[PDB]
Amino acid sequence: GRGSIARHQDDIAIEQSHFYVEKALQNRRENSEQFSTTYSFWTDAYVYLGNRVDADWAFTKNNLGSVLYTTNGYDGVFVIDDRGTRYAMLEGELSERSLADSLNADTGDILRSARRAAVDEAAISRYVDFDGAPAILVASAIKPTSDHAPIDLAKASVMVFVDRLTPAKLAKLGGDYGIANLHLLAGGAAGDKESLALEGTPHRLAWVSSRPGS
Amino acid sequence: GRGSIARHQDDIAIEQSHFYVEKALQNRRENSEQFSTTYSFWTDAYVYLGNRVDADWAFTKNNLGSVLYTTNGYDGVFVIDDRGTRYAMLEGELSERSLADSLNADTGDILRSARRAAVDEAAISRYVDFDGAPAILVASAIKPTSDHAPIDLAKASVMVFVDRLTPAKLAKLGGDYGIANLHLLAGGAAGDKESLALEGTPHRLAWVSSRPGS
């Protein structure tokens, strides 16, 4: 036997808490990537949101409309292409504010990455500063299903879902994963709290280290 | 202060393991409930599946087709109404086997429960024995969105999604939540393993007692 390594119970609790905050975020992102490909790998979406955007089909007829906010919690829903933002829904209402104006991240990178990932039937996800708030962004190319003739993914439009990590959403997420008082770290010092970075943003999530799930 | 209560470290680990398995299941169920209403609260779905089921639209045109299995992992996708099963897709292929023949649970109960929940814009979920295997079932009424004229939900058809808890899905779910060797309990005794019941089924989930995550 090499011998055991005994650990401080607080160190174990802190390690578990970081593990479960990371898993909460990863699981949220993977669920949202699946949601995005559900809405974007869809022949109807390719017809009505590829090329010219039919806001009547998307918003008035509720095919990509306010429910995505009032039920699914996507504070931002966008269709973008090489010219920029072609459709914008902010908090369930039509908006003229472009995705690029709302984000710290480069939207051309989002467009290109979503186009490439669509080759593997995949979406992309990342963290962003959405108008000064932490958010998870997911994006996937708008393409028809396999019964349709093939298209060139290099020119496909891209659907974007922006999930702002509000105090209420963070508190529910923390409860979902047994984390005590998950919140956006206010100042620059965590002090008594543990914290992690939402990489690609200046935001950090912080929480009180207690025995998680107890 | 009342004074502290010190606990056995293995007892804490066991309590945390039960907490995170229960959260793993609840979060999976809530996600599938959202997925179900994404597909069922949909005017096109009401048109092509609400009464007579158009399998060309659903399967050939991939609006409710094989991707729901090959990407989203739903081993069973059904449309049911007062007459029984109107549409059945098993492992991504059209099937003649009814939902009622596949379940231990009563499908009239599912129809009624979903038709009611739709009044509150909700789906329903439960655990089932799906042809001898543990599964999560979710169901929601097929109804158009609010721009459409009102319909009678009491006569609406119901979409049903069946997520079979295969060994691969269970191992991945367990890893998602820091659980060691999550599996379908083989025999009748867990012995050294922890277990919980999938209520409404004879199935139990079992796992090896470890410090979760860590």
Author numbering:
A (entry chain A), B (entry chain B): 36 to 249
Question: What did the study's authors say about this model?
Answer:
We solved the crystal structure of CHASE4IsmP at 1.9 Å resolution with P22121 symmetry. Each CHASE4 domain contains two discontinuous subdomains: the membrane-distal subdomain and the membrane-proximal subdomain connected by a loop. The former exhibits an alpha+beta fold pattern, which contains a core five-stranded β-sheet, with other helices distributed on both sides of β-sheet; the latter mainly contains a three-stranded β-sheet, which is connected with the former through short α8 helix. The dimeric form is maintained by a pseudo-symmetric interface mainly consisting of several polar bonds mediated by Q51, W55, K96, 97 N, T180, D182, W212 and P247 from either chain in a dimer. In addition, the sidechain of N107 interacted with the Q69 from the other monomer via a hydrogen bond. Furthermore, the native-PAGE and SEC results indicated that CHASE4 domain exists as a dimeric form in solvent. The isothermal titration calorimetric (ITC) analysis showed that CHASE4 efficiently bound to trivalent Fe3+ with an approximate Kd of 7 μM but it did not bind to Mn2+, Mg2+ and Fe2+. Due to advances of computational biology, a putative Fe3+-bound CHASE4 rough model could be established based on in silico analysis. Clearly, at least three amino acids, including E65, N66, and Q69 may play a key role in the Fe3+ binding to CHASE4 according to this model. ITC assays demonstrated stronger binding affinity of IsmPCHASE4 towards Fe3+, however, the IsmPCHASE4 mutants exhibited weaker, even no binding affinity with Fe3+, suggesting the critical role of E65, N66, Q69 in Fe3+ sensing and ultimately binding.
Cyclic dimeric guanosine monophosphate (c-di-GMP) serves as a bacterial second messenger that modulates various processes including biofilm formation, motility, and host-microbe symbiosis. Here, we show that iron regulates c-di-GMP levels in Pseudomonas aeruginosa by modulating the interaction between an iron-sensing protein, IsmP, and a diguanylate cyclase, ImcA. Binding of iron to the CHASE4 domain of IsmP inhibits the IsmP-ImcA interaction, which leads to increased c-di-GMP synthesis by ImcA, thus promoting biofilm formation and reducing bacterial motility. Our prediction results reflected that ImcA contains six membrane-spanning domains and a GGDEF domain while IsmP is a multi-domain protein comprised of several domains including the PASPAC (IsmP273-413), GGDEF (IsmP413-585), EAL (IsmP585-865), and CHASE4 (IsmP59-220) domains.
